[PDB]
Design an enzyme around this catalytic site. Sequence first.
Site, PDB file in Angstrom:
ATOM      1  N   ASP A  52       0.789  -1.226   0.000  1.00  0.00           N
ATOM      2  CA  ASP A  52       0.000   0.000   0.000  1.00  0.00           C
ATOM      3  C   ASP A  52       0.823   1.279   0.000  1.00  0.00           C
ATOM      4  O   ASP A  52       1.845   1.390   0.684  1.00  0.00           O
ATOM      5  CB  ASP A  52      -0.889   0.009   1.231  1.00  0.00           C
ATOM      6  CG  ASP A  52      -1.876  -1.118   1.231  1.00  0.00           C
ATOM      7  OD1 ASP A  52      -1.513  -2.217   0.749  1.00  0.00           O
ATOM      8  OD2 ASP A  52      -3.005  -0.894   1.719  1.00  0.00           O
ATOM      9  N   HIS A  54      -1.270   4.510  -0.850  1.00  0.00           N
ATOM     10  CA  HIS A  54      -2.354   5.453  -0.534  1.00  0.00           C
ATOM     11  C   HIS A  54      -2.061   6.940  -0.633  1.00  0.00           C
ATOM     12  O   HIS A  54      -2.132   7.641   0.376  1.00  0.00           O
ATOM     13  CB  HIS A  54      -2.898   5.180   0.873  1.00  0.00           C
ATOM     14  CG  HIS A  54      -3.726   3.934   0.979  1.00  0.00           C
ATOM     15  ND1 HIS A  54      -4.889   3.751   0.262  1.00  0.00           N
ATOM     16  CD2 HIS A  54      -3.586   2.832   1.756  1.00  0.00           C
ATOM     17  CE1 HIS A  54      -5.433   2.595   0.598  1.00  0.00           C
ATOM     18  NE2 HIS A  54      -4.663   2.017   1.503  1.00  0.00           N
ATOM     19  N   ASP A  80      -3.588  -0.331  -4.126  1.00  0.00           N
ATOM     20  CA  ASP A  80      -3.964   0.629  -3.074  1.00  0.00           C
ATOM     21  C   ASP A  80      -3.136   1.942  -3.220  1.00  0.00           C
ATOM     22  O   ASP A  80      -2.466   2.393  -2.276  1.00  0.00           O
ATOM     23  CB  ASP A  80      -3.762   0.013  -1.669  1.00  0.00           C
ATOM     24  CG  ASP A  80      -5.076  -0.449  -1.016  1.00  0.00           C
ATOM     25  OD1 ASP A  80      -6.004  -0.824  -1.777  1.00  0.00           O
ATOM     26  OD2 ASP A  80      -5.162  -0.449   0.248  1.00  0.00           O
ATOM     27  N   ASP A  83      -6.645   7.241  -2.056  1.00  0.00           N
ATOM     28  CA  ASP A  83      -7.372   7.401  -0.795  1.00  0.00           C
ATOM     29  C   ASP A  83      -6.457   7.633   0.435  1.00  0.00           C
ATOM     30  O   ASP A  83      -5.259   7.336   0.399  1.00  0.00           O
ATOM     31  CB  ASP A  83      -8.254   6.185  -0.562  1.00  0.00           C
ATOM     32  CG  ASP A  83      -9.416   6.129  -1.525  1.00  0.00           C
ATOM     33  OD1 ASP A  83      -9.730   7.171  -2.145  1.00  0.00           O
ATOM     34  OD2 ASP A  83     -10.023   5.050  -1.647  1.00  0.00           O
ATOM     35  N   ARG A  84      -7.024   8.165   1.515  1.00  0.00           N
ATOM     36  CA  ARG A  84      -6.276   8.436   2.747  1.00  0.00           C
ATOM     37  C   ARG A  84      -5.193   9.515   2.629  1.00  0.00           C
ATOM     38  O   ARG A  84      -5.281  10.553   3.278  1.00  0.00           O
ATOM     39  CB  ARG A  84      -5.624   7.160   3.272  1.00  0.00           C
ATOM     40  CG  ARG A  84      -6.590   6.035   3.530  1.00  0.00           C
ATOM     41  CD  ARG A  84      -7.571   6.384   4.614  1.00  0.00           C
ATOM     42  NE  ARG A  84      -8.441   5.256   4.906  1.00  0.00           N
ATOM     43  CZ  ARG A  84      -9.319   5.233   5.899  1.00  0.00           C
ATOM     44  NH1 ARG A  84      -9.454   6.280   6.705  1.00  0.00           N
ATOM     45  NH2 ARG A  84     -10.059   4.155   6.089  1.00  0.00           N
ATOM     46  N   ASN A 112      -8.072  -3.089  -3.247  1.00  0.00           N
ATOM     47  CA  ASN A 112      -9.473  -2.879  -2.941  1.00  0.00           C
ATOM     48  C   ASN A 112      -9.891  -1.425  -3.121  1.00  0.00           C
ATOM     49  O   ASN A 112     -11.081  -1.141  -3.285  1.00  0.00           O
ATOM     50  CB  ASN A 112      -9.773  -3.359  -1.518  1.00  0.00           C
ATOM     51  CG  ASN A 112      -8.970  -2.628  -0.461  1.00  0.00           C
ATOM     52  OD1 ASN A 112      -7.731  -2.464  -0.597  1.00  0.00           O
ATOM     53  ND2 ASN A 112      -9.640  -2.207   0.607  1.00  0.00           N
ATOM     54  N   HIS A 113      -8.915  -0.515  -3.121  1.00  0.00           N
ATOM     55  CA  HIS A 113      -9.186   0.915  -3.278  1.00  0.00           C
ATOM     56  C   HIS A 113      -9.198   1.379  -4.723  1.00  0.00           C
ATOM     57  O   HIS A 113      -9.558   2.512  -4.994  1.00  0.00           O
ATOM     58  CB  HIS A 113      -8.176   1.757  -2.485  1.00  0.00           C
ATOM     59  CG  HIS A 113      -8.509   1.903  -1.031  1.00  0.00           C
ATOM     60  ND1 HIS A 113      -9.307   2.916  -0.547  1.00  0.00           N
ATOM     61  CD2 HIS A 113      -8.159   1.158   0.045  1.00  0.00           C
ATOM     62  CE1 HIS A 113      -9.436   2.791   0.764  1.00  0.00           C
ATOM     63  NE2 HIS A 113      -8.748   1.732   1.148  1.00  0.00           N
ATOM     64  N   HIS A 162      -3.194  -8.157  -3.779  1.00  0.00           N
ATOM     65  CA  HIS A 162      -3.471  -7.179  -2.753  1.00  0.00           C
ATOM     66  C   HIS A 162      -3.977  -7.706  -1.421  1.00  0.00           C
ATOM     67  O   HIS A 162      -3.363  -7.466  -0.373  1.00  0.00           O
ATOM     68  CB  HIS A 162      -4.452  -6.103  -3.252  1.00  0.00           C
ATOM     69  CG  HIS A 162      -4.709  -5.031  -2.232  1.00  0.00           C
ATOM     70  ND1 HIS A 162      -3.711  -4.206  -1.761  1.00  0.00           N
ATOM     71  CD2 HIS A 162      -5.810  -4.740  -1.497  1.00  0.00           C
ATOM     72  CE1 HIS A 162      -4.179  -3.462  -0.776  1.00  0.00           C
ATOM     73  NE2 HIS A 162      -5.450  -3.766  -0.592  1.00  0.00           N
ATOM     74  N   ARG A 209     -14.279  -6.858   7.972  1.00  0.00           N
ATOM     75  CA  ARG A 209     -14.398  -5.692   7.119  1.00  0.00           C
ATOM     76  C   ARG A 209     -15.725  -5.642   6.358  1.00  0.00           C
ATOM     77  O   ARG A 209     -16.122  -4.578   5.847  1.00  0.00           O
ATOM     78  CB  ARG A 209     -13.269  -5.657   6.098  1.00  0.00           C
ATOM     79  CG  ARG A 209     -11.869  -5.724   6.691  1.00  0.00           C
ATOM     80  CD  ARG A 209     -10.831  -5.326   5.648  1.00  0.00           C
ATOM     81  NE  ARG A 209      -9.473  -5.656   6.070  1.00  0.00           N
ATOM     82  CZ  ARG A 209      -8.392  -4.958   5.722  1.00  0.00           C
ATOM     83  NH1 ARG A 209      -8.512  -3.883   4.954  1.00  0.00           N
ATOM     84  NH2 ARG A 209      -7.186  -5.342   6.124  1.00  0.00           N
ATOM     85  N   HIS A 236      -2.451  -4.825   1.967  1.00  0.00           N
ATOM     86  CA  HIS A 236      -3.782  -4.516   2.465  1.00  0.00           C
ATOM     87  C   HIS A 236      -3.955  -4.346   3.984  1.00  0.00           C
ATOM     88  O   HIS A 236      -4.956  -3.781   4.429  1.00  0.00           O
ATOM     89  CB  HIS A 236      -4.671  -5.638   1.927  1.00  0.00           C
ATOM     90  CG  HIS A 236      -6.117  -5.527   2.266  1.00  0.00           C
ATOM     91  ND1 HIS A 236      -6.951  -4.611   1.660  1.00  0.00           N
ATOM     92  CD2 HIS A 236      -6.911  -6.323   3.026  1.00  0.00           C
ATOM     93  CE1 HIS A 236      -8.198  -4.863   2.021  1.00  0.00           C
ATOM     94  NE2 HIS A 236      -8.202  -5.896   2.846  1.00  0.00           N
TER      95      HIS A 236
HETATM   96 MN   LIG Z   1      -6.426  -2.682   0.931  1.00  0.00          MN
HETATM   97 MN   LIG Z   2      -4.968  -0.168   2.200  1.00  0.00          MN
END
Ligand SMILES: [Mn+2]
Ligand SMILES: [Mn+2]
Lengths: 288, 7, 581
Positions: A52, A54, A80, A83-84, A112-113, A162, A209, A236
């Site tokens: 990741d 991000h 990933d 985001d964030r 997943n993002h 991921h 999750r 992840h």
């Molecule tokens: Mn993830």
């Molecule tokens: Mn992540």
Amino acid sequence: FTKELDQWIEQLNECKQLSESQVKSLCEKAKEILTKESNVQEVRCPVTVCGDVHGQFHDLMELFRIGGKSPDTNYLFMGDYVDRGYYSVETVTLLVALKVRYRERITILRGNHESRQITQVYGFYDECLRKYGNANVWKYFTDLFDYLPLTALVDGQIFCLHGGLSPSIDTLDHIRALDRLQEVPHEGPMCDLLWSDPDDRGGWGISPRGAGYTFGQDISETFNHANGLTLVSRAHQLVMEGYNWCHDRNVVTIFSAPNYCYRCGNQAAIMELDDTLKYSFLQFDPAP
Amino acid sequence: XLXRXXX
Amino acid sequence: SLYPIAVLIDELRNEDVQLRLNSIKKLSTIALALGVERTRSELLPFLTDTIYDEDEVLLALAEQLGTFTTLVGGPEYVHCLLPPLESLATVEETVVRDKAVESLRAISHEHSPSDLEAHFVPLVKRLAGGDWFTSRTSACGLFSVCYPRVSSAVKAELRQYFRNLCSDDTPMVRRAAASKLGEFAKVLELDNVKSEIIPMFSNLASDEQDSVRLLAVEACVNIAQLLPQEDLEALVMPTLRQAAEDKSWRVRYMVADKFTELQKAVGPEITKTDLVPAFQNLMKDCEAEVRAAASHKVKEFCENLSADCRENVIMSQILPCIKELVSDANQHVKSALASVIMGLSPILGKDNTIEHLLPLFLAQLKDECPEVRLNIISNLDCVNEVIGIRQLSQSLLPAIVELAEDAKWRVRLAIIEYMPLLAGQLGVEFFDEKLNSLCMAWLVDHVYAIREAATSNLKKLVEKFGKEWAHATIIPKVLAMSGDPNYLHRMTTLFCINVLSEVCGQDITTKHMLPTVLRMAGDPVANVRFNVAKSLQKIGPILDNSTLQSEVKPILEKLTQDQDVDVKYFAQEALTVLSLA
Ligand SMILES: [Mn+2]
Ligand SMILES: [Mn+2]
């Protein structure tokens, strides 16, 4: 064109976004290149495997400081990218840019993002509205994400993805059999690969999750033996130490975003697989 | 701890 | 206008009688077009008035007028030059007023004693007793020159006016008088220095304005040298001791700034009696500016101590204070001390240095501010030449290695920098024995940035020991990495060859480095294959053309056929840049 990519890249390295015009283009070719790749992308070592990122652009630059610069150093990112973080746009665009300039120097997987739904809840969407003035660049990248490989296989022994293992997939052929060209679903094999988590309760479990599953050691052992894998490499999951071993080393978690969201105080790590598939980890704090 | 979808 | 002179004028702009600048420099030529006779009657007058703030012109005019004593008739006519200069002296732009003074000061010596009294001094009074201030500010710079040659009765007058300038209602005229008190003092005969200078000095030292007091410190240095040691205690020291305690840190700052100068001007006895304690007080000032200024003076002060009982005041009166300062809060201060501290080695001896200074040397060497430790690292020489290279290697080397292998790569990165310093300072013989290893190690560090650091760091070592030392101590161990199974390390080799071509020269490159490069063109890992193309394109221009046709051109053409995309592209690129395409 090549001269142009080099340019865009030099630009993006100064943390300067590209135009909407150039994103549209950069994305249209990235699609070309990525369609040809498979749900289980073949990767020849040596290669550095990262987790990741991000949008933490400045930590990404710290990562290159530690593992070498592209194209000199081969890289494999397990998704990933957005985001964030505060710079999802600069980050993702740089990476996609590198992939279009150097198809054989970098491999980018889907996380997943890299999805339309979650990007509208965790950043990447609004950041685009802020940096450009409409949802176009988001549309281009979220469309592009649909072509991102779900999994990578390094030297037929190291399996990278991921998230994790799926109770509806026991074979690499099973995975090659999926249609990855679509938004990530809320459930199923494609969803599970990008959403599951290794665990310390045996067999399958309920994912805390709300997507994919948890899987214990026994499950990994089986999946590895059945596919001739030396180990499963995923990300992840924030892991304080940057990287984490589990399932009697059948599985390894690699998180590449130090002090995640600028709030959790985790180290970041990156895994080097040399000319001989020999592995070594590089831990790193956030760049100052 | 930022929200289980993930510190 | 008229023509012999109208050449000076610039009739093309739109100004107010403005002059052609390049022409005011070809001034001592129009002075010939008309003779001395007409230089005085038309040229000078024209110059006196007709003064349009062109500054750049006014400046050249003030400078030029200084070398006109002859073009005017010689010494019997120098005073013809006063009027225009007097003018320029009272201008605005200080720069010009300065030049005016420099020149007036210059031609002053051309005036006969009789003409000084007759023309010069009078101009001095008028500037002194001027209404406006710049006039007064510039007058202060003209006292010392005329004082000696004029009559006893006129000297007096000169002292009076100078006095009135120190006690001028304005601070600027006062700062001015203060800054010239020293030179004026130096040309008066003792009795008057005692009776007139001292009082002026006392007065200015206790000025309401600290911008003026601050300046009496320098005047003090001068007055103190002019007087016999016995008279110091009565006429100066009380005033000086007050300055070191002065309310204004700026004033105290000046005392620390000119401490070494006072030391010499006051003699060794007073230095042991009065200055050593003051030095301690300044190094303990609450204002970091003062402490740091004071620390900066430490070595120079200790050198100047009476060889007599020097070494004892240091261990008893100074060393303590130093130990304190090494731990100071302000890095501004720690900084000043570090940039001179080890210079105390020769003064204290190889034994004292080892037992007392070496510990402080370490403290600072492991200080936070990498600036402070850099100050220690840049000044190892004197500590080295005092104690032995081993006695030092034994106190420093552990500190270094200690860091050359640390947690944060950033910290290790810091040590890589000291390398070319330590190198060219402790000598090649020490570098080959105790340092080279660390430098070779970093070439293969885990962190890329560190490898990169140490790579380009080799170049800076060749610049310190030469292409011969390179071919014998570095190219060998570097070329080895080409057999390494890790491609990250194999590429490091080419990266070191790329930089070393820059300073090893056409011969050593072609014979020892080019081979290894050409050979790796058949490396199993594509990233190495294309970096080899790039290395050829880098070290290409260092090879003679016969080399570029014999083995380079061939190799690149081969690579362009490679299966790997990037290797192809870089091979083509390499060729297109070398012209071998
Ligand atoms: Mn993830
Ligand atoms: Mn992540």
